[PDB]
Design an enzyme around this catalytic site. Structure first.
Site, PDB file in Angstrom:
ATOM      1  N   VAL A   7       7.719  -0.810   5.002  1.00  0.00           N
ATOM      2  CA  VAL A   7       6.706  -0.980   3.967  1.00  0.00           C
ATOM      3  C   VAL A   7       5.380  -1.359   4.632  1.00  0.00           C
ATOM      4  O   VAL A   7       5.366  -2.146   5.580  1.00  0.00           O
ATOM      5  CB  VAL A   7       7.150  -2.028   2.910  1.00  0.00           C
ATOM      6  N   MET A  12       0.813  -1.212   0.000  1.00  0.00           N
ATOM      7  CA  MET A  12       0.000   0.000   0.000  1.00  0.00           C
ATOM      8  C   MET A  12       0.850   1.267   0.000  1.00  0.00           C
ATOM      9  O   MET A  12       0.433   2.297  -0.527  1.00  0.00           O
ATOM     10  CB  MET A  12      -0.914   0.005   1.224  1.00  0.00           C
ATOM     11  N   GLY A  13       1.999   1.190   0.646  1.00  0.00           N
ATOM     12  CA  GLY A  13       2.886   2.319   0.774  1.00  0.00           C
ATOM     13  C   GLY A  13       4.238   1.948   1.329  1.00  0.00           C
ATOM     14  O   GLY A  13       4.473   0.818   1.765  1.00  0.00           O
ATOM     15  N   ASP A  51       7.180  15.064  12.660  1.00  0.00           N
ATOM     16  CA  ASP A  51       7.100  14.754  11.227  1.00  0.00           C
ATOM     17  C   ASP A  51       5.688  14.938  10.683  1.00  0.00           C
ATOM     18  O   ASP A  51       5.142  14.054  10.020  1.00  0.00           O
ATOM     19  CB  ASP A  51       7.697  13.375  10.879  1.00  0.00           C
ATOM     20  N   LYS A  81       3.194  15.999   8.164  1.00  0.00           N
ATOM     21  CA  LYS A  81       3.204  16.162   6.718  1.00  0.00           C
ATOM     22  C   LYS A  81       1.983  15.474   6.146  1.00  0.00           C
ATOM     23  O   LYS A  81       1.374  14.645   6.828  1.00  0.00           O
ATOM     24  CB  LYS A  81       4.508  15.621   6.104  1.00  0.00           C
TER      25      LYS A  81
HETATM   26  C1  Y9T Z   1      -6.738   3.918  -3.885  1.00  0.00           C
HETATM   27  C2  Y9T Z   1      -7.506   3.765  -2.597  1.00  0.00           C
HETATM   28  C3  Y9T Z   1      -8.367   2.533  -2.719  1.00  0.00           C
HETATM   29  O1  Y9T Z   1      -8.385   4.889  -2.498  1.00  0.00           O
HETATM   30  C4  Y9T Z   1      -6.604   3.782  -1.360  1.00  0.00           C
HETATM   31  C5  Y9T Z   1      -5.914   2.474  -0.994  1.00  0.00           C
HETATM   32  N1  Y9T Z   1      -5.046   2.675   0.161  1.00  0.00           N
HETATM   33  C6  Y9T Z   1      -5.316   2.339   1.463  1.00  0.00           C
HETATM   34  C7  Y9T Z   1      -4.186   2.724   2.144  1.00  0.00           C
HETATM   35  C8  Y9T Z   1      -3.991   2.595   3.498  1.00  0.00           C
HETATM   36  C9  Y9T Z   1      -2.767   3.127   3.868  1.00  0.00           C
HETATM   37  N2  Y9T Z   1      -2.414   3.090   5.231  1.00  0.00           N
HETATM   38  C10 Y9T Z   1      -3.124   2.535   6.275  1.00  0.00           C
HETATM   39  O2  Y9T Z   1      -4.178   1.909   6.216  1.00  0.00           O
HETATM   40  C11 Y9T Z   1      -2.500   2.784   7.587  1.00  0.00           C
HETATM   41  C12 Y9T Z   1      -3.302   2.788   8.709  1.00  0.00           C
HETATM   42  C13 Y9T Z   1      -2.713   3.059   9.920  1.00  0.00           C
HETATM   43  C14 Y9T Z   1      -1.355   3.284   9.967  1.00  0.00           C
HETATM   44  C15 Y9T Z   1      -0.633   3.246   8.795  1.00  0.00           C
HETATM   45  C16 Y9T Z   1       0.845   3.444   8.766  1.00  0.00           C
HETATM   46  F1  Y9T Z   1       1.406   3.961   9.873  1.00  0.00           F
HETATM   47  F2  Y9T Z   1       1.495   2.261   8.628  1.00  0.00           F
HETATM   48  F3  Y9T Z   1       1.263   4.225   7.740  1.00  0.00           F
HETATM   49  N3  Y9T Z   1      -1.184   3.012   7.606  1.00  0.00           N
HETATM   50  C17 Y9T Z   1      -1.855   3.696   2.975  1.00  0.00           C
HETATM   51  C18 Y9T Z   1      -0.508   4.220   3.428  1.00  0.00           C
HETATM   52  C19 Y9T Z   1       0.438   3.066   3.611  1.00  0.00           C
HETATM   53  C20 Y9T Z   1       0.125   5.200   2.448  1.00  0.00           C
HETATM   54  O3  Y9T Z   1      -0.577   4.940   4.643  1.00  0.00           O
HETATM   55  C21 Y9T Z   1      -2.097   3.773   1.614  1.00  0.00           C
HETATM   56  C22 Y9T Z   1      -3.308   3.285   1.208  1.00  0.00           C
HETATM   57  N4  Y9T Z   1      -3.850   3.247  -0.017  1.00  0.00           N
END
Ligand code: Y9T
Length: 286
Positions: free
Chosen positions: A37, A30-31, A144, A146
């Site tokens: 990761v 996801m990120g 941090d 942002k």
């Molecule tokens: C295209 C769409 C379907 O609209 C979107 C899909 N999508 C869903 C996501 C969830 C995410 N993160 C979390 O759920 C999440 C929740 C709690 C804590 C944390 C972290 F600390 F580890 F960062 N991450 C991310 C990130 C990893 C960037 O935070 C990106 C995503 N993209």
């Protein structure tokens, strides 16, 4: 603690063996960023976010610090930690999944998501300020702040994330951390103060108004914070910079949010408003 300890094999199982392909291609990534990761997982009958951490002792300190902050800080505008894993070959943190990802990705319309409306942007700015207020009331400095660290749930409610470098003005450090495009001048010099979180929030408010990233090497100015000087020197107006990907922005509330951002971005730390004043101004805006 009150958190669940997960088996590394269970987390490996529910993320398709930590499938590094992006979710859009059929993988689980996801990120990436904050010393690891993040993967999409499925525990019980619930979607979760699994952050797999990757100095060894420096990484373990960030793991321990995040757990410590999450154990103490629970609020509607902060992410929720469900559990952790420290038994396999890698450290993992498990959170409640944020279906709309980060504010950074929604502002850039990553993966084809529709542009956020001005109405949604106002709610997000208010929510993020409420989360920072909770952290500052509980004597924590994020360090941090942002748009990548402001996550969005199923209702686009803003949730502050990444507390690995959070600290429980005044204090100095030999290890300067943060993201340069969002950092206050005193933070870049090694000072540790909640006044620096306010400055970073000012950059986030500019990202919300303009839809532009805080730094873009192929842009003039490269740093978004420099638009404050262009507007003050009457070279440009806030109207010139308003995100064109909105159809519901009204000049009055955009100018009100810009006024808050401008105050947050004061170069002198003691002249910036505190988070309570920022909250009040954002509430008055709507
Ligand atoms: C295209 C769409 C379907 O609209 C979107 C899909 N999508 C869903 C996501 C969830 C995410 N993160 C979390 O759920 C999440 C929740 C709690 C804590 C944390 C972290 F600390 F580890 F960062 N991450 C991310 C990130 C990893 C960037 O935070 C990106 C995503 N993209």
């Amino acid at each position: 603690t009150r958190f669940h300890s997960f088996s590394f094999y269970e987390l490996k199982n529910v993320t398709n063996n930590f499938d590094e392909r992006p979710i859009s291609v059929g993988g689980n990534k996801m990120g990436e960023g904050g010393f690891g990761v993040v993967y999409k997982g499925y525990v019980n009958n619930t979607t979760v976010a699994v952050k797999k951490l990757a100095t060894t002792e420096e990484l373990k300190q960030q793991f321990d610090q995040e757990i410590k902050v999450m154990a103490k800080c629970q609020h509607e505008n902060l992410v929720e930690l469900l559990g952790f894993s420290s038994d396999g070959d890698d450290l993992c943190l498990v959170y409640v999944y944020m279906p709309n990802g980060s504010l950074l990705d929604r502002l850039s319309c990553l993966d084809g998501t529709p542009p956020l409306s001005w109405h949604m942007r106002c709610k997000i700015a208010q929510g993020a300020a409420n989360g920072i207020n909770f952290l500052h009331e509980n004597h924590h400095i994020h360090r941090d702040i942002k748009s990548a660290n402001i996550l969005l749930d199923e209702a686009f409610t803003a949730k502050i994330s990444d507390f690995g470098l959070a600290r429980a003005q005044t204090v100095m450090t030999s290890r300067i951390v943060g993201t340069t495009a969002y950092m206050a001048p005193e933070a870049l010099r090694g000072e540790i103060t909640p006044k620096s979180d306010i400055y970073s929030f000012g950059v986030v408010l500019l990202e919300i108004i303009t839809g532009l990233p805080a730094v873009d090497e192929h842009r003039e100015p490269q740093l978004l914070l420099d638009i404050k000087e262009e507007i003050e020197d009457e070279e440009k107006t806030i109207e010139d910079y308003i995100d064109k990907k909105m159809n519901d922005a009204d000049s009055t509330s955009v100018e009100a949010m810009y006024s808050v951002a401008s105050q947050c971005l004061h170069e002198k730390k003691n002249k910036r408003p505190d988070i309570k004043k920022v909250q009040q101004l954002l509430q008055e805006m709507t």
